[PDB]
Each structure stands twice: as C-alpha cells, then as structure tokens.
Design a protein around this ligand. Sequence first.
Ligand SMILES: O=C(O)CC[C@@H](O)C(=O)O
Ligand SMILES: [Cl-]
Ligand code: NI
Ligand SMILES: [Zn+2]
Length: 349
Amino acid sequence: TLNPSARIMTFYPTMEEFRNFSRYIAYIESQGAHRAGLAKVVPPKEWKPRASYDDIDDLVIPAPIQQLVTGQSGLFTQYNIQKKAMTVREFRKIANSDKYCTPRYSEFEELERKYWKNLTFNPPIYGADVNGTLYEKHVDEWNIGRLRTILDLVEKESGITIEGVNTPYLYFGMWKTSFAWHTEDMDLYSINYLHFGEPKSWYSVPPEHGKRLERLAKGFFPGSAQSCEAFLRHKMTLISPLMLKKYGIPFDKVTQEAGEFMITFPYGYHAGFNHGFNCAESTNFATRRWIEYGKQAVLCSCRKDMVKISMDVFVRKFQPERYKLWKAGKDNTVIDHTLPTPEAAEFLK
Ligand SMILES: O=C(O)CC[C@@H](O)C(=O)O
Ligand SMILES: [Cl-]
Ligand code: NI
Ligand SMILES: [Zn+2]
C-alpha cells in the first residue's frame, strides 16, 4: 500500500487546497501520511495567522513548569515543578539568559547529542498548557481555534469543553524543554503550529508499531506499569532514539520550524524538545477514522480529571448499525492503522 516505509512525510498545499482543513487531512491520509504517526505541512507563503507577535510580551503564563529530569542510559522520568506566574517577556528574558540559552552547534545531530547528554542538568522552565490562541480573529484557514471537524460534536451536544482538546493551548519553550512520549487523549489527532522562535524537534513511532513501544516502556518502567494501564499518558517518560534503535522500535525524526504545521495521528506516539525560546499552539481534532480509536483508547486509570470523552454520540451518529452491538460490549472491530479515513475516498479514485 502507500508509504510502506511509514516515514514522516511533508506537504506543501496551495492556498486552494489549504482552505478546507478536514479535506486536506483526508488527502494526506490518501497518500499514507498517517502511517508514520506524524506529518509536516508547510502552509502557503501567502498565509499568516497573525500580523505581528510583538504585542504579547504582557501575555501571562499562569503556571510555568520547571522540568526536573532524572534517569540514565536513555531512560528518563520527568517531574514537574510549578513556578509562579510570569509574562512572556519575563519568560523570554530567562530563556535567553546565558544560563538557559541554546548551546553552540553546527549540525542538528550535534544539538541532539547535547540534548540527550544534558537533559538531566540545569532544569529549564516550560510555559506550557497556556489557555489562549495567537490566531487573528478573521483567519479562516487552519485556525486552531475553529478547525470545524467532527470533534465539535462534543461541545455542540453536551456543552463540555476540555482545555487543550477542543480549545487551543499555547506553549512557550526554551532550550532543553521537552515533551515525553505519548499519544493524544482518546487517541485523537493533533495539530501543532509553531508561531515563532527556535525549532522544535520531533520523534515519532508508527501507529502500527505503537504496541511495541508500550511493551518496551512497560519493561523499563514496571512500577509505573503496575500502577496504571496507560502510564505513558502522564507524559513523564522520556526514551532516547538510541534506546529505541537498540530494541528495534521503528521510529522517525523531524525538526519543525517556525511557520510550519505538525499533525499527529490517532495512536501515533511522539516526543521531542525545543531548540530554544519559541511559541507553539496546538489542540486536538478528529475524523471518522478516529471514532474507532476513541472507542478503544486505553485510558489512564489512576488520575482524576483525566480526559475521557463519551463515544456514544459518535457511535450513534456514524456507526448506527453497530450501536447496540457496541453498547452491549460486543463490538470487536480490529483497527487497521494503514487504512486512510473514509473522507479520503474521493482521492483514491
Ligand atoms: O504532544 C503533542 O501533541 C505536542 C506537545 C508539544 O506541543 C509540547 O510542547 O508539549
Ligand atoms: Cl517575538
Ligand atoms: Ni501530543
Ligand atoms: Zn494514570
């Protein structure tokens, strides 16, 4: 089938193709993009979500996070220490200080080695999970604030909003800040735009090999595994690419740059780190292909306020012939990670 390498793909849509979000996602899936779990989409040169970013210095980061990393030989656990609120100006001041700034380097392979060699030292601050958007109110193409996908059935039918899932999150980062391995809540899709700043590097494991990654993680962190069915959802586990390589876990890497979009797919494990001071925005979204992932997503069974979406409305509206079967817990549909979402039908003929 398509993209049998399950390698990370990059797309350059024209302004025409760009306009319909859900439609372009259907397209890239018809090209096998999802098989890698992660994909890059470079927006048209004439596209910009905001005019200028010189007016956010006063924007407040209510819960900055200091990332303490503990571990050795490729396996680490990240602990969060919440610091007092601060502004984007204060944050940047710190991000650029000779204390937390980016080390000198030539090729990316070098910055990478330095990241994996010093991530346990000099714990950085991460202005993550910040409620808000940097999109201009009139931007109608790929506006994270309103992608208009079926995930809207959640708020529209129940009124329930889940910060970060069906509302945007801003992430202000600095050198060495990172994000642990994980898939989205309810195994949804994810859209990430890097408004500005230094690059953000990503690691991705193909959804078709996700179970292998979990198996490995469970063997390394048996304690966390025995305490939770999906401890990777805590987002505290870091695993180096060398360790994955050494245990035969298929994975790919890619560096996202300011102005580019990254898309993660259902059950696509990903992790990465920021090269330096930057700002990114993200939220989740869905397609009809997601519904099945949602019904089968293995959720965190030890924390409260953990994201759990009712799959009822989706199964009832898009899988009516399986609703009673599903409701009776008799629906044993097996998921094929290679198949594109049905909306991509028009692109396969
Ligand atoms: O987990 C993701 O989808 C990306 C998270 C990334 O934006 C971060 O800074 O944590
Ligand atoms: Cl700026
Ligand atoms: Ni994610
Ligand atoms: Zn848990």
